[PDB]
Amino acid sequence: GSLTEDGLSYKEKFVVRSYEVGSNKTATVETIANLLQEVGCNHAQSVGFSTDGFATTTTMRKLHLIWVTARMHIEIYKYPAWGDVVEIETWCQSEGRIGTRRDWILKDSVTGEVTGRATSKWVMMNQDTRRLQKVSDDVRDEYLVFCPQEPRLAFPEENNRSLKKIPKLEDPAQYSMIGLKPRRADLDMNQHVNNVTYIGWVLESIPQEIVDTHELQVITLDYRRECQQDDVVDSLTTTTSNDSQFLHLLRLSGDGQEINRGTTLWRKK
Amino acid sequence: GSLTEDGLSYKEKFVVRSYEVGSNKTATVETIANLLQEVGCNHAQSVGFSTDGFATTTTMRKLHLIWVTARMHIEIYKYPAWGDVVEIETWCQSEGRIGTRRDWILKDSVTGEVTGRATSKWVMMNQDTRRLQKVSDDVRDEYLVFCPQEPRLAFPEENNRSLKKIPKLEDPAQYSMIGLKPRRADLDMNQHVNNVTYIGWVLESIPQEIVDTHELQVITLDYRRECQQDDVVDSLTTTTSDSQFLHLLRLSGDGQEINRGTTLWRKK
Ligand SMILES: Cc1ncsc1C(=O)N1CCNC(=O)C1
Numbered sequence: 001g002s003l004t005e006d007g008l009s010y011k012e013k014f015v016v017r018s019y020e021v022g023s024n025k026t027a028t029v030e031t032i033a034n035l036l037q038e039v040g041c042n043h044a045q046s047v048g049f050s051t052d053g054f055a056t057t058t059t060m061r062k063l064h065l066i067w068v069t070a071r072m073h074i075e076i077y078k079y080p081a082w083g084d085v086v087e088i089e090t091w092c093q094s095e096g097r098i099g100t101r102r103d104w105i106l107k108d109s110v111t112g113e114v115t116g117r118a119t120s121k122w123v124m125m126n127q128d129t130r131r132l133q134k135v136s137d138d139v140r141d142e143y144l145v146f147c148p149q150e151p152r153l154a155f156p157e158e159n160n161r162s163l164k165k166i167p168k169l170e171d172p173a174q175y176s177m178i179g180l181k182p183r184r185a186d187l188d189m190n191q192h193v194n195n196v197t198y199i200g201w202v203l204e205s206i207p208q209e210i211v212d213t214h215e216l217q218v219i220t221l222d223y224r225r226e227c228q229q230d231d232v233v234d235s236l237t238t239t240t241s242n243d244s245q246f247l248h249l250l251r252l253s254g255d256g257q258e259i260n261r262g263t264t265l266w267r268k269k
Numbered sequence: 270g271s272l273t274e275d276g277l278s279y280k281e282k283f284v285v286r287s288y289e290v291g292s293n294k295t296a297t298v299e300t301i302a303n304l305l306q307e308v309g310c311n312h313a314q315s316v317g318f319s320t321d322g323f324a325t326t327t328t329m330r331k332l333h334l335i336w337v338t339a340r341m342h343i344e345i346y347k348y349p350a351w352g353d354v355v356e357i358e359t360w361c362q363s364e365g366r367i368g369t370r371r372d373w374i375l376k377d378s379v380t381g382e383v384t385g386r387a388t389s390k391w392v393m394m395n396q397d398t399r400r401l402q403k404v405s406d407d408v409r410d411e412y413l414v415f416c417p418q419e420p421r422l423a424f425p426e427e428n429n430r431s432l433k434k435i436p437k438l439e440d441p442a443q444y445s446m447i448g449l450k451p452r453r454a455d456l457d458m459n460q461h462v463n464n465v466t467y468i469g470w471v472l473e474s475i476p477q478e479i480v481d482t483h484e485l486q487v488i489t490l491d492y493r494r495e496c497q498q499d500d501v502v503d504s505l506t507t508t509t510s511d512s513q514f515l516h517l518l519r520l521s522g523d524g525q526e527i528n529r530g531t532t533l534w535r536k537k
């Protein structure tokens with residue numbers, strides 16, 4: 001991988017692995033999400049961020065602050081097959097005091113065509129108190145160093161799916177998968193549950209017949225609260241709709257505390 | 270990746286990923302096991318095996334046969350850190366009518382030193398009846414085309430750890446993790462639970478304090494029966510001792526054994 005000529009974005013190629021594919025012999029959405037996270041991490045290292053798994057700036061370390069995901073939105077047109085080379089371009093942008101955004105474009109390395117796109121919103125959090133906060137002036141000035149100054153969006157459109165409000169699923173759910181627990185392979189190097197695991201848990205309550213007959217086209221996931229290593233999760237899904245749409249909810253199995261909410265759009269194979 | 274000059278082994282380089290590492294910022298044993306499986310699949314594709322996830326020969330397809338894992342043994346001296354390049358060399362060998370073996374050597378790409386080694390035993394199974402079989406004359410002939418004819422072993426030593434008999438853990442277990450279930454990311458392209466998932470489930474019953482203070486040096490795992498997509502597993506562990514453990518994976522309900530194994534850990 002490497003930064004582009006202007007030093008304002010980063011590109012990396014990946015060869016899709018045997019264990020990274022599903023029944024259709026193409027990359028799962030979890031493999032796509034792991035690759036987005038990997039290229040994001042390589043971009044951060046290349047522009048001088050912390051090499052400790054937290055990707056913080058100098059001002060962030062002085063104030064004991066970290067970036068936490070608020071939303072992930074992924075749209076896939078073609079999933080790369082086992083053995084194909086996918087090229088992913090990524091860049092960051094500051095959104096005033098709200099937070100920051102990381103965007104991605106996925107391409108077929110051979111044809112050069114765009115096969116997918118993604119966007120993620122990140123918010124500032126104090127590492128100690130776990131309280132969300134606004135982005136300060138000094139942090140906004142550090143982002144100018146490596147971010148394009150004219151707006152560059154993976155999802156530019158006037159009314160795009162990436163910015164839609166997601167409602168809270170009402171009981172009873174149409175489908176459910178209960179008692180989901182993370183194992184050590186679900187944790188990152190800092191022992192927090194990997195953001196990609198929440199995607200897999202959301203999808204666990206989609207009926208197998210939908211997965212067997214449809215391709216996942218869009219997924220939008222809101223991150224409300226973290227699942228801990230010793231927490232147990234319930235994944236709930238209700239149909240909201242040639243195209244199938246679902247509303248999703250992840251909550252703690254005990255008290256029912258919400259951890260994530262989201263939506264998926266599937267098209268017939 | 271590519272076959273070596275003699276066409277009897279295969280080499281591939283991997284850059285260790287951010288999500289592939291543990292708290293020590295080095296590759297987990299599950300990442301090592303996934304990389305062994307990946308280079309194994311690339312080797313099979315390059316020597317003309319089926320490209321459907323089963324890696325069968327032409328006589329295996331006519332007889333409706335597939336290879337199933339009987340044992341996996343991995344010994345790691347140094348786990349590669351996040352961003353390091355690891356080089357893995359793999360080859361196969363026929364063991365008469367018993368089955369076949371796939372062996373691996375892991376090296377630090379920069380220094381050229383051996384940082385680990387692995388060996389796996391595979392047995393023939395009829396895909397329809399699920400009955401184990403011996404390897405027939407015709408499939409032993411096909412293995413001669415891409416396997417070294419003089420013995421090449423990752424664990425050559427007589428009476429080594431990779432060939433030891435593993436006992437069955439007796440209740441009560443000292444430690445346990447119950448109610449483990451596979452999700453879709455645990456399945457392979459043919460919807461069977463990935464062999465690497467069983468390694469993770471074995472390790473789930475090791476106390477966190479052992480993981481925090483020790484490095485895993487050796488793991489030997491026997492595969493007895495497959496966990497299905499709708500099965501629930503209990504992982505049991507008892508200390509037998511350097512720290513050594515005896516492990517058992519069994520179905521949550523009736524207690525049917527699926528795997529048994531051992532691990533050896535060294536103080537950090
Ligand atoms: C530079 C940056 N700005 C907003 S997100 C982000 C980033 O690259 N990451 C990936 C690693 N860990 C994180 O928490 C965030």
Ligand SMILES: Cc1ncsc1C(=O)N1CCNC(=O)C1
Nearest residue numbers: 309310313322323324336369391
């Ligand atoms: C060629 C060969 N011979 C014994 S094991 C093996 C092998 O490469 N694999 C990896 C893919 N799927 C399998 O079932 C076994």
